[PDB]
Amino acid sequence: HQAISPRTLNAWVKVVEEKAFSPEVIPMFSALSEGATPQDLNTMLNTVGGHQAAMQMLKETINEEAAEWDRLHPMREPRGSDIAGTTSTLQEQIGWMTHNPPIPVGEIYKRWIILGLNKIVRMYSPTSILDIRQGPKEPFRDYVDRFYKTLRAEQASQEVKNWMTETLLVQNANPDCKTILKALGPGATLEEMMTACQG
Amino acid sequence: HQAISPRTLNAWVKVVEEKAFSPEVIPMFSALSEGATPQDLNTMLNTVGGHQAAMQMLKETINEEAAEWDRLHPMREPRGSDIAGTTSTLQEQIGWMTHNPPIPVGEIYKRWIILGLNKIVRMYSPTSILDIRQGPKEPFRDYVDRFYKTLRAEQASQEVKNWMTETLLVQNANPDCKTILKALGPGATLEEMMTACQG
Amino acid sequence: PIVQNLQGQMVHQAISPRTLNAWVKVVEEKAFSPEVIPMFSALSEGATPQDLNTMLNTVGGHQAAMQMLKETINEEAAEWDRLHPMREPRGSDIAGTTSTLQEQIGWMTHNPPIPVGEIYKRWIILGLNKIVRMYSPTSILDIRQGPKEPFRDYVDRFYKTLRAEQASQEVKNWMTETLLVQNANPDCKTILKALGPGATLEEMMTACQGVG
Amino acid sequence: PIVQNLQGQMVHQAISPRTLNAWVKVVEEKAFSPEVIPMFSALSEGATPQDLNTMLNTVGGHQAAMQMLKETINEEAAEWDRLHPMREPRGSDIAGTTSTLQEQIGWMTHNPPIPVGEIYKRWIILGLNKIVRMYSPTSILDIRQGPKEPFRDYVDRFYKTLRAEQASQEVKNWMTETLLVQNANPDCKTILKALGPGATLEEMMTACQGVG
Amino acid sequence: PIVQNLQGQMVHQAISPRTLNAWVKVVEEKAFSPEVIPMFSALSEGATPQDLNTMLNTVGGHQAAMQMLKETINEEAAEWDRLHPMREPRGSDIAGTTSTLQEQIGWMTHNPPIPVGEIYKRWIILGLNKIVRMYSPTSILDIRQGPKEPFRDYVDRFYKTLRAEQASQEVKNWMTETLLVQNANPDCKTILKALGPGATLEEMMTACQGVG
């Protein structure tokens, strides 16, 4: 067994602190927590200072997923709470991972954490995408960058996102860009839209 | 035996001096001092520059724990001071950990440090959980953040913490949010409560 | 009541003087609240018709209540004689005005027993229910929670008035479901409505604890 | 109850009318305070399931409380049948709705006795505990000592509310240790904090006598 | 209690349900006034240790009072075992936790009788005295006659507080002699002092009748 690096822990704390709960924190967490035990994941979650409302929401999501795991599955076999790391121990976790075939308790807990963090990101998105409107002289590149950051935050359905990018993206634009976008018409990819709408 | 890394030592000193004494200091210490000998733990504690009142408190609590160990427990078997590393050598400390069987001299001293840090954090918390109260205009998100930071610093049993989580969060809210939370009723979850009290 | 002899024969047991005094205190001090009927049911456990008549002699002091109690007993006796035209108990015999004590004891010891005492007790309870319905100080629609009254006190008053009114069971269910919320004070009424329809009384009381 | 005959045979003893009237007074006048459960335990000493059902007929007047009492009795009967699949007492037999009185008497006189009465009493006490938890006028966090209230009255109110709330034993211990000091008025709270943690209630009451 | 059989054998008599309910009312409604101990002595006449434990189950609802009552019973049991190292009653046997009912009945019917019930009653009374000493709302030095209070009411309050405090007999005599005069209002205090020292309470009350 290898411990998580202090550099990795500091990186996780720093990215969480600076970015709050922007959508990129999920891929950053998945990158930093590769091959991590439930003990390591619990350590990384505990070391986060601030946003304790979000961390409690994550705890409640973990508890709900553990209850679902226990309902689906009524040495000692790993229960849902055992996978969560609250009741298990490091030796048990490593044994479960080393078993052939393995019980990837780390990946299950990571998936639960990812679900909780997606819910946190959706809750913490600053404004709804309907309110993302271009300014009178804001660049179209800046406005569409903001629009797509917000759209990534919402995590709406695929069809809903398609409709949004097709219709609301041009609807919320200022008249100067809006006229050009309607001239391009429906079916235009984003590349074509803003490469024709530049300047 | 490995020497404690300068990067790890600087990280511990920086987190202590920057966060003063917050609840995250306990898991940060547990993560940094993984597989640490009593000499390494003493190095980590002594290297801290400021908060010398808190370090004296931690020394006092370590002394009390060593006295309790001496009372309960009348390669030589180590005494409390021997566990604390005040009257033991590095070779003797690696003894009882490489021994067959090994008694975890490092983990016992780490546990004592954890108890002392728990007391330090409990008192360094600004207000008690019962005294945490939402302001007339405070948003529910920041009120919840303060509440759960204080609960993390509360230093009570887990059942009592669960009761606090279910009751005091609703009880301490301002009437504007208290009415909405009562309409939600018991059985709600923090996501639903925060979405309801967003306004 | 009825008590077995030392040799197994069942013989009449006279109602104790302090039991009668307790019934007198219930009749005189309680002012015909809804709780007189539970207390009448408790004090008259196993009572024969003669004992029941002895108890009714105490409520005989009130002229109107005694009159309606007697008329209701007569009506139920007429119904009994209509359905039921030792000897068979007649309507007046159940009341204990024409029969004799040994006859009542024999009826109560039949195999299967003839529950004459329970029948007369039920008729008396019907009459007492009517008397309680008269003496209710307010109707259910006039019960309103005060601005500062706790919801527990308002619920207790509401259900006491509901017991006094004695409407139909479906009407009673509708009343407890809807009129309880309607008559609550606005701050409590908001939470009651927010709970939604079909909420159990436990949910309403837990949600509204300390709101007043 | 159960009473021995003159020749040694154990036979059912009917619950006295004034005992039932006392239970009725507890149910009707006390408004489901925490003290109803001690009084129910006292009045139902040695009671059989039939006697317990007779007592429950009086609290049957309140619809909500009766409903939850019946549902809790049903739940505990289901648990009993789960663990326990003359004849063996079934869940409905313990309640006294399907069994017969002689069967209950025989169960209570077994060697060793089958404590059917105590079991049904415990189920009823669970239901009454739930009913008391509903009717509590305030939660424990809302009990606060007044500026002039003596600490004895505040402690009595606090422990009454604690009995009404019925939290976990560890949570209850934490509450009496901490929340009692927290909710005390400032002049009394100063002495409570100065006493330090772990102080017994006797120390708190003796130190705070006359402070208010 | 204990009751003789029809053939002369002494057998255990169960404590009546309404006696237990009376004890429950004393425990719950009286708030541990000094009068609970006379009432406990009255209600527990002839009680066996099992009956006493049944009565203590009702005061078990209060955690602190039950804890000190149990610890005082344990202390007196330890003293009994120290002085006293069928079979001899042990300390736990007097409490009725280890012994059996027939053993207690046999002890109470010995020639001369072994007063186990009175011993356990005395231990319980010691514990109740301690509990009453805690719950006293004011100390004896804080009892002061009001400007308009009659001397009879002030004397009654003073002696109630004296019973609650339970000081030494010599200290109690000094208190009733001196502190009663000291705390009286000035117009009554003048007459009390003019009566001189050693005046009986009858003289003080007769002289001060109507002064307030």
Residue numbers in the entry:
A (entry chain A), B (entry chain D): 12 to 85, 96 to 220
C (entry chain C), D (entry chain C), E (entry chain C): 1 to 85, 96 to 222
Sentences from the paper on this structure:
The mature HIV-1 capsid is composed of the capsid (CA) protein arranged in a conical lattice of hexamers and pentamers. CA assembles into a conical lattice formed by roughly 200 CA hexamers and exactly twelve CA pentamers, the latter of which facilitate lattice curvature and closure around the viral genome. Monomeric CA consists of two folded domains connected by a flexible linker: The N-terminal domain (NTD) faces the outer surface of the capsid, where it stabilizes the hexamer, while the C-terminal domain (CTD) forms dimeric interactions that link hexamers together. Here, we present cryoelectron microscopy structures of continuous regions of the capsid lattice containing both hexamers and pentamers.
We therefore devised a lattice assembly scheme in which purified wild-type HIV-1 CA-6xHis is anchored to highly curved ~30-nm small unilamellar vesicle (SUV) scaffolds doped with nickel-chelated lipids. To determine whether SUV-templated CA lattice is comparable to that of CLPs and authentic capsids, we determined the structures of SUV-templated CA lattice in the presence of IP6 at pH 6.2 and at pH 7.4 by SPA. The estimated resolutions for the global pentamer structures were 3.3 Å and 3.1 Å, respectively. As predicted, the increased lattice curvature results in a significant increase in the pentamer to hexamer ratio, from ~1:20 to ~1:5, suggesting that fewer hexamers are needed to form a complete lattice around the highly curved SUVs. The global pentamer structures are virtually indistinguishable between CLP and SUV-templated lattice preparations. Although our CLP assembly scheme recapitulates the morphology and composition of authentic capsids, it only works at low-pH (pH 6.0 to 6.2) conditions. The liposome scaffold-based CA lattice templating technique we introduce here enabled us to overcome this limitation and to study lattice assembled under more physiological buffer conditions.
